[PDB]
Amino acid sequence: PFDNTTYKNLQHHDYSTYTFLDLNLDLSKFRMPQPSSGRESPRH
Amino acid sequence: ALFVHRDTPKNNPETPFDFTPENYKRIEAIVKNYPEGHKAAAVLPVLDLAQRQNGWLPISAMNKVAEILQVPPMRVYEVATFYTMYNRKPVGKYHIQVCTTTPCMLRNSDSILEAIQKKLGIKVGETTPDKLFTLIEVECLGACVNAPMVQINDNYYEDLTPKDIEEIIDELKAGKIPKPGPRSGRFSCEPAGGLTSLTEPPKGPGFGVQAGL
Amino acid sequence: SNLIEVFVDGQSVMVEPGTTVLQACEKVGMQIPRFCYHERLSVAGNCRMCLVEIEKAPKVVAACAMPVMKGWNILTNSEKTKKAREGVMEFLLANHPLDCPICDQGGECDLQDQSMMFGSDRSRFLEGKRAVEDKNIGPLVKTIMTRCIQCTRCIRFASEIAGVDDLGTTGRGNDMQVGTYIEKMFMSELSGNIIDICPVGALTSKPYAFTARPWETRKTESIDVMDAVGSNIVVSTRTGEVMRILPRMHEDINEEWISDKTR
Amino acid sequence: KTSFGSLKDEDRIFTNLYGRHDWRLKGAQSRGDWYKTKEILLKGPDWILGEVKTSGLRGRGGAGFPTGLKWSFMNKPSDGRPKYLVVNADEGEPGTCKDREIIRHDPHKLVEGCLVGGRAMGARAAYIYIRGEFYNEASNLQVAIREAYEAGLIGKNACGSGYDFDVFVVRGAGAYICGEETALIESIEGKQGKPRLKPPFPADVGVFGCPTTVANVETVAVSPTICRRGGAWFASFGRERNSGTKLFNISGHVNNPCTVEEEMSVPLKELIEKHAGGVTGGWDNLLAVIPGGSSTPLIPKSVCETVLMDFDALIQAQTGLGTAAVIVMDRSTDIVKAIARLIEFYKHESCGQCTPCREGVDWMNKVMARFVRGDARPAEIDSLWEISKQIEGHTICALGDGAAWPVQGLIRHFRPELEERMQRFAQQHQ
């Protein structure tokens, strides 16, 4: 069927105060290894 | 409102603050996004995490973020006093942000601000004595066609009448959670007198694709 | 040699690839008015006083930061360059306090001198000025932060030379304040040299404070004896009494700094 | 083509702009997104740059810089530093609410845009600097990025093309100046949102000192549609060097304030009367229009009759396109209160780095707060004009320009209204 009268974006009603950070914690296992600048910090 | 710190008993470097261990896993997830040698770039999420744990930033979260990221504490003081979200004073649980810039002042968000002020008995910047509602007045929040709109801690409440925001405050006082959307007859941002566009079905895969692709 | 040819007021000069506009004007004996550029600190570019016109280019460039490209005619005394300098000096003198009599920097102030040289001669600011809370950063530095023009030589000195990383800019906009944000006492071994580089009288010398005035001082170029580095100093006296000790430039010892014990 | 406007629904780039369809992966692949992505990635950076240059795509961020010519600065060999496509998703401009709609409702179009753009410029990852106020939109985009990783579309071996590409989302913290590209770079680096100076451009020294292209949500999301549909298709709409479609946010005093995708050179009267139903009280009730958000100077009712809503025809009207955010202000509006509130926005949102903005924007807000009451003499209008000319072009970024421009527009188009304001103040208080 085709719908044009309902708003299918109802997920944001259930987001808590840690949804973004839990999603980042979920996505931390899919990522490529970060490059290194030859040091620990620019004060090292 | 002030951008210096005075060591009150409830706000000092001896004020208790430490992340929960799941928040330490979250800070690991934040720091692992940025390249090696630029760990300092994880100031702004982690410090916002240190606001989402406590509700506000005493000066121990600034010191803790400077301690776990090994950056100078002044470089976190600059971030906490530069950005308008890092509440350095204890706000209420429902931090109400009323947008009254020009596209919302044209659509009379002053009536909504007056309604919230007479409903809560407070004014802009003050806090209700039960420490539920903090009413301040902010700049453009990015819902300009959905003007006039307010923000409650994560949520946008849009196309508001004074009656609508009185209804939202009523269903916030009793402990319930409202629906973060436009309170008029439209759904997100469409023309209120019906869809003037995108009524046709989207075609799907393969439509209009050039050859050699 | 890969030296390139640029033009300052039409005068040809041969510079290095990577030379800024300010050094390109320095090579012909010209000095651009500046507040945040310091030749031993990093380039900030946040006072906009060094704005100079490149011809056939409808926008003034920041001479402290902008490297020269091959063939620029750097117009230093043009019309829109002087309008840029007068406008930026007007904005620096909008919220600045009328403290020139009670200020120790009077007579040795950059802001007074290049307001007299490069700015206008009167005012338009018919409003109320800001007033900034004074900071406590030590027994050596008297801090009157209403005079701070927010040029960030504090931060660049404490971060790059003194290596302290404890000064900064809190706030945002016309409420932005250079300070420490807490009751912290800025005590390094070079914590008095911030009195030198501050172009205004925001950071004055607290032992020197209110005693003297630089036009009636006599300069005597002497040597430090406090350490075995041999810092070139000026003993500046007044009527047979040593008022203070300024640094001297020497590229092989103390480049233009001295320790706090020396000062 | 001579006439412009009345764009068909089949030629829209942002289908599911209104949230009526599923924003997720099964919804996005049912609307043409993530289709033949591997065949776009395998044909090289040069083919994608040629498609974007041939399309006539300009900067949808607001300056209108040529997007293919912008992205071709990054097509240069490595030097040990990685490269980064960084999506400017702040959108703090008043009147402008379109990138909120793109992130909230068409996120996979933005993710495929990050992938095709990062292939086009050799970039390694994607940093979507989303606004901190857009929290639910950020979690929305993170769910879509999870659906893009778990389907094997991005990450290690993106779409099976041998190309590796990550996508990050960095939330902001409530600063309008962090929408400027260099201040956005400075905000991602864990510092204050203070803009860098140009040159170094971000294509040489950008985020973390890497080569970087900071690009708008719109000009990133439309680029896989440009690569699939063609360059000549996207170039056919609008005028020449004003090619394509554009999102328009009609807000203010209209009957139906709304976001709508529309052809580039559409007339303003046709746009407001069709998609917004016209001005409240009819078109004769119109007083002024800020055409493209707060940075652009306003135009009166005498200019809105024949003006076209692209870059060049608004530059001919001595204003700008900018973000294509039509703020409509009818006859019931104190325009001086609105522009003084707009200068109050530009002094509450200004990072305080360099002199003319930090001092003069507060000083223009004080002079405009007196112009609202009329507590001045008319020689302070022209004075204020000079103050704008002492800010416009003498600052680091274009927020000093974006604050000098509305004062100039208000003076230039309603000088006598300010003068009669001040004279009735002067007679009623003396």
Ligand SMILES: NC(=O)C1=CN([C@@H]2O[C@H](COP(=O)(O)OP(=O)(O)OC[C@H]3O[C@@H](n4cnc5c(N)ncnc54)[C@H](O)[C@@H]3O)[C@@H](O)[C@H]2O)C=CC1
């Ligand atoms: N979309 C939004 O939310 C907002 C948009 N704006 C608009 O943004 C514009 C101001 O942005 P700016 O970045 O200050 O202006 P624009 O001159 O700098 O910059 C646009 C792009 O052009 C590139 N560019 C220009 N000349 C270049 C060169 N010679 N070499 C390399 N790259 C070059 C820059 O890298 C930049 O990415 C205005 O039109 C304003 O209306 C302003 C506020 C908010």
Ligand SMILES: Cc1cc2nc3c(=O)[nH]c(=O)nc-3n(C[C@H](O)[C@H](O)[C@H](O)COP(=O)(O)O)c2cc1C
């Ligand atoms: C003060 C200021 C704020 C800006 N804010 C944004 C913004 O929020 N979003 C955006 O896409 N561009 C913004 N811009 C424009 C950017 O400088 C830049 O043109 C754009 O982000 C990327 O260029 P593009 O048009 O090729 O995408 C802003 C510019 C200025 C001067």
Ligand code: SF4
């Ligand atoms: S800092 Fe300079 S301009 Fe300011 S009061 Fe002191 S002498 Fe006068």
Ligand code: SF4
């Ligand atoms: S106190 Fe002086 S040196 Fe420090 S930032 Fe202010 S004007 Fe510059």
Ligand code: SF4
């Ligand atoms: S002019 Fe204003 S917005 Fe720009 S760098 Fe300076 S303080 Fe920032």
Ligand code: FES
């Ligand atoms: S002006 Fe209120 S949301 Fe943009």
Ligand code: FES
């Ligand atoms: S000296 Fe170049 S801007 Fe301050």
Ligand SMILES: [K+]
């Ligand atoms: K000084």
